[PDB]
Amino acid sequence: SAPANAVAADNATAIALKYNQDATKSERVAAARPGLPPEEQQCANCQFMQADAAGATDEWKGCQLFPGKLINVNGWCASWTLKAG
């Protein structure tokens, strides 16, 4: 089940960032952010994802832009940035 501090779709920051916990429902194709075909972009391959966040699970991870909350590994927002090694 989902953690109580999962980012909600109606959170003001979520709305400002165009976050969707399901990337397939997001505006990723239209946003065409660089580095990777948009249909492969998700929190899992984003520079801002923080896997060592409190409460992280296989599905729910931290994000630098959402302090104290958890995003969905399969989500996306308009700040998506390709993770560099």
Question: Annotated binding site for [4Fe-4S] cluster: which residue ranges?
Answer: 43, 46, 63, 77
Question: What is d(CA 50, CA 56) in angstroms, rounded to the nearest whole number?
Answer: 9
Q: Is 6 in the site for ligand SF4 (CB under 6 A)?
A: no
The answer to whether 55 and 70 are in contact (CB under 8 A) is yes
State which of residues 19, 20, 60, 69 lies at the interface with ligand SF4 (CB under 6 A): 19
Using CB under 6 A, which of 6, 20, 49, 70 touches ligand SF4? 49
- DSSP annotation string for 10-73: TSHHHHHHT-BSSGGGSSHHHH--TTS-GGG--GGGBTTEETTSTT--SSEEEETTSTT-BEET
Is residue 53 part of the contact set for ligand SF4 (CB under 6 A)? no
Residue of 6, 20, 53, 65 interacting with ligand SF4 (CB under 6 A) = 65
Q: Which residues bind ligand SF4 (CB under 6 A)?
A: 19, 43, 46, 48-49, 63, 65, 71, 75-77, 79-80
